[PDB]
């Protein structure tokens, strides 16, 4: 009954090699035979990730067709086509097709193609079976198999390491940092096994081996591992619906319910009085056509696409419309430190000498830009012997070479090379000829070279060593103070240890340097502080974002000290900020987690599950978080969040393909510009949505009043479709691209639970609809003769409705600002739209085939003057209301 239990990474880490092998029934030397691996694979399945399949585009088209409004429109179309009204039916189906095409384009998936996650997995693996090392695919691996790891070989599964010599594994897939973690074979205590990064005896799937060789026993395959859990979380997580999308859905369902109730009561009251079935069906089709605003989604999609292109011009790639729209009104921003805040380039910032001098080094990156200051004085070359000796020791004893701003070697060594180059000592290494080399190993933690001067070979040999302070100070016997060589005392070691501890508490990496004639008689020069500094201009941008309405959080993969130091540098750890680890996050209840999340801003040692839990807790109380990252765990976090902001030209492909916006030439001012553009687009969307809703309900209630008060249909489906789609479009697009005011880009972001329709907005909409209905009814009653539909009456009604809609759009162009301050032809797009609408109306009135199609007569100059003068009535009362509310605001101020 061979039944292997699932050995977690923690439990395997605690268990020594013998018990792990006994539980897994795995032979460390001879490996597994084919029968046992076949049976285990038959039980545990394959070591493969199933990406599954998506749904075809036609299913999405059908689902978009499944809207209740689309059913109502299709019912109206089928009723029209069943009544020998093929022209009206054709127009209705054309409008329906356009509407669903626009909706599908707007709601089209951004082509995630999330198979990049299943590519940081080796296709082959060097496994040992039946005492023979065989080249097999990783998909054939099973728990209990023995896998040999080499340099450049990607870890194919979770392995319990039992043999390892100087094994450094790149773990930038679960931690997200390119710091090779040393791997050991001894079991780990349960006290330090809280974090994944502390598991030095476990080789995780998807990680790359940088140096050394090792052999491990598989403890997990496929979906029962760390990478498997990450894949499960990514696959089972979908992008939440944006607050804009939720508001649009609520408005649509409310409109559908209202229209259904209205048409039901209209049918009931018509049947109570008694009407012909043909006329009842025609009236029902009329209200069905007038109930659905067809141009609103088209205008929304067009204006959002225009904003997306404008931000693309502003160096911001956008793939989906509503997600960036809700990002424009985001509340919380979470960003990774290693890959987004810091540029992932170790730089020396603090230098401490044996004499006791403290030196601060400016500049970021592997470039000569930057100065070394001591007591406020810039030191160049060999000006200060104390600092110069440390720089020389770090420079000659260095295997790293920096070419055209790209580092080849260890990042800490590159930091020393950059520090030397900033001081003008970039060519010092060529001046010395190395005779003996002692390398940097995880067992020794120190690097030394024996070199003699190139032009002064007859000078005695000088030895330079760098490494950890504890190991370096052993070989140190003397120290230099003010040019004099003094013997090392215990007090000197004490103060050096205190300085090292102080530097370590500030998130700096402590490296010791020493020099002397022979090993064991070396002289200690001092210590250097190496940290990952933030990018340039990042602090000012973060301050600008946090100044108005944004509370920026922080998720960090390093320990508490580095996160605290980075937050203090940015300003997120001033005096009272707290740091919470992932184990604490998973410890308390979700209610306590939601209580503790908003009052903290620093997170250290966070797994992908920890980031997902933090994002869910932030979104639980109601907020629009903006997660930012560049790693696989970061990518999972962005997938969990509604909006995903990635890092361009410096992040992984998985994060780029799993995000929403790609930030080439990574800036935060671009994020601010995107937020301002989103706010302006939301304001314009509200404006033209209000205009379209007012027009739609005005037409609906006008038709209802005409039906109740017993006149025939004034407008058919074709007239309403022509008004809504062809001519009401460009004005709404111009309103969508209306220039923004100085008060829109400012002010804290709005709460996400609000609705587009407000009390004042709906009151103005109702007033405008009532005015339009009264005008249209008066015109129809005046131009009606013996209950006979005259082509002149139809033309007058059409022109009056067109003019009223145009003037309503003009009045709804802006709120609480009138048209005098903004001025006519401010953007000239509204002027072009008005001119086009006027030309189209004139063509409809005068062109003979258009007259025959629309059943309209020819108008005179007097009729045009009458219709122009009567139309401006709504504008006067609109400006009166605007002045009234302006006066109310003035007296309230
Ligand atoms: F790069 Al990280 F948490 F520091 F994903
Ligand atoms: Mg990162």
Curated annotation (Swiss-Prot):
Active-site residues from the entry: 336 (4-aspartylphosphate intermediate)
Tissue: Found in most tissues except colon, thymus, spleen and leukocytes. Expressed in keratinocytes (at protein level).
Residues in compartment: Cytoplasmic: 1-56, 110-248, 299-685, 737-756, 815-827
Outcome after substituting residue 187 to L: In HHD; has normal catalytic cycle
Binding site for Ca(2+): 289-290, 292, 294, 724, 728
Subcellular location(s) of the protein: Golgi apparatus, trans-Golgi network membrane; Golgi apparatus, Golgi stack membrane
Protein name (Swiss-Prot/TrEMBL): Calcium-transporting ATPase type 2C member 1
Organism, scientific name: Homo sapiens (Human)
Originating gene: ATP2C1
């Amino acid at each position: 009954e061979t039944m292997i239990p699932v050995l977690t990474s923690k439990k395997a880490s605690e268990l020594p090699v013998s018990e792990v092998a006994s539980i897994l029934q795995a032979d460390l030397q001879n490996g597994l035979n084919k029968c046992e691996v076949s049976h285990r694979r038959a039980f545990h399945g394959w070591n493969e990730f199933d990406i599954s399949e998506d749904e075809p585009l036609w299913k999405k088209y059908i689902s978009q067709f499944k809207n209740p409004l689309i059913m109502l429109l299709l019912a109206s179309a089928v009723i029209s086509v069943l009544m020998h009204q093929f022209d009206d039916a054709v127009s209705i189906t054309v409008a329906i097709l356009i509407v669903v095409t626009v909706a599908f384009v707007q709601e089209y998936r951004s082509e995630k193609s999330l198979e990049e996650l299943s590519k940081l997995v080796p296709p082959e693996c060097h496994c040992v079976r039946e005492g023979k090392l065989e080249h097999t695919l990783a998909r054939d691996l099973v728990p209990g198999d023995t896998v040999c790891l080499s340099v450049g070989d990607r870890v194919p599964a979770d392995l319990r390491l039992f043999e390892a010599v100087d094994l450094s594994i790149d773990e930038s897939s679960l931690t997200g940092e390119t710091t090779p973690c040393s791997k050991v074979t001894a079991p780990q205590p349960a006290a330090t096994n809280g974090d994944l990064a502390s598991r030095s005896n476990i080789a995780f799937m998807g990680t790359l081996v940088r140096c050394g060789k090792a052999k491990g026993v598989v403890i997990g395959t496929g979906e029962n591992s760390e990478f498997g859990e990450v894949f499960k979380m990514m696959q089972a997580e979908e992008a939440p619906k944006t607050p804009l999308q939720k508001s649009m859905d609520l408005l649509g369902k409310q409109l559908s319910f209202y229209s259904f109730g209205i048409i039901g009561i209209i049918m009931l009251v018509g049947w109570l009085l008694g009407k012909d079935i043909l006329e009842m069906f025609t009236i029902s089709v009329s209200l069905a056509v007038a109930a659905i605003p067809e141009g609103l989604p088209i205008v929304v999609t067009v204006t959002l696409a225009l904003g997306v292109m404008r931000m693309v011009k502003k160096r911001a790639i956008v793939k989906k419309l509503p997600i960036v729209e809700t990002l424009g009104c985001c509340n919380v921003i979470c960003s990774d430190k290693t890959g987004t805040l810091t540029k992932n380039e170790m730089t020396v910032t603090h230098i401490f000498t044996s004499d006791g001098l403290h030196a601060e080094v400016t500049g970021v990156g592997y470039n000569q830009f930057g100065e070394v200051i001591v007591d406020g004085d810039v030191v160049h070359g060999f000006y200060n012997p104390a600092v110069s000796r440390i720089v020389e020791a770090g420079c000659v004893c260095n295997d790293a070479v920096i070419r055209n701003n790209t580092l080849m070697g260890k990042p800490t060594e590159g930091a020393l090379i950059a520090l030397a180059m900033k001081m003008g000592l970039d060519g010092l290494q060529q001046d010395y000829i190395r005779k003996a080399e002692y390398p940097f190993s995880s067992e020794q933690k120190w690097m030394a070279v024996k070199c003699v001067h190139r032009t002064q070979q007859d000078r005695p040999e000088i030895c330079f060593m760098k490494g950890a302070y504890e190991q370096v100070i052993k070989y140190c016997t003397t120290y230099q103070s003010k040019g004099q060589t003094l013997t090392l005392t215990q007090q000197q070691r004490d103060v050096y240890q205190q300085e090292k501890a102080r530097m370590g508490s500030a998130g700096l990496r402590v490296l010791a340097l020493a020099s002397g004639p022979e090993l064991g008689q070396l002289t200690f020069l001092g210590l250097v502080g190496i940290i990952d500094p933030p990018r340039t201009g990042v602090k000012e941008a973060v301050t600008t974002l946090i100044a108005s309405g944004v509370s920026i959080k922080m998720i960090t993969g390093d320990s508490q000290e580095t996160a605290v130091a980075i937050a203090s540098r940015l300003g997120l750890y001033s005096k009272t900020s707290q740091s919470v680890s992932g184990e604490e996050i998973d410890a308390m209840d979700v209610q306590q987690l939601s209580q503790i999340v908003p009052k903290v801003a620093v997170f250290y040692r966070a797994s992908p599950r920890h980031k997902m839990k933090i994002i869910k807790s932030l979104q639980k109380n109601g907020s629009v978080v903006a997660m930012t990252g560049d790693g696989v765990n970061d990518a999972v976090a962005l997938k969990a969040a509604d909006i995903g902001v990635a890092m361009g030209q410096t992040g992984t492909d998985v994060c780029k393909e799993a995000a929403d916006m790609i930030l080439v030439d990574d800036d935060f001012q671009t994020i601010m510009s995107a937020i301002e553009e989103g706010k302006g687009i939301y304001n314009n969307i509200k404006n033209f949505v209000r205009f379209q809703l007012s027009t739609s309900i005005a037409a609906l209630t006008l038709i209802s009043l005409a039906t109740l008060m017993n006149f025939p249909n004034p407008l058919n489906a074709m007239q309403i479709l022509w008004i809504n789609i062809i001519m009401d479009g460009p004005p709404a697009q111009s309103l969508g691209v209306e220039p923004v005011d100085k008060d829109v880009i400012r002010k804290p972001p709005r709460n996400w639970k609000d609705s587009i329709l407000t009390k004042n907005l709906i009151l103005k909409i109702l007033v405008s609809s009532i005015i339009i209905v009264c005008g249209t009814l008066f015109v129809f009653w005046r131009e009606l003769r013996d209950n006979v539909i005259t082509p002149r009456d139809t033309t007058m009604t059409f022109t009056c409705f067109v003019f009223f809609d145009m003037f309503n759009a003009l009045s709804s162009r802006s709120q609480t600002k009138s048209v005098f301050e903004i001025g006519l032809c401010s953007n000239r797009m509204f002027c072009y739209a008005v001119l086009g609408s006027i030309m189209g109306q004139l063509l409809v009135i005068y062109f003979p085939p258009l007259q025959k199609v629309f059943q309209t007569e020819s108008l005179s100059i007097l009729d045009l003057l009458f219709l122009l003068g009567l139309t401006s009535s709504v504008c006067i009362v609109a400006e009166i209301i605007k002045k009234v509310e302006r006066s109310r605001e003035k007296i309230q101020k």
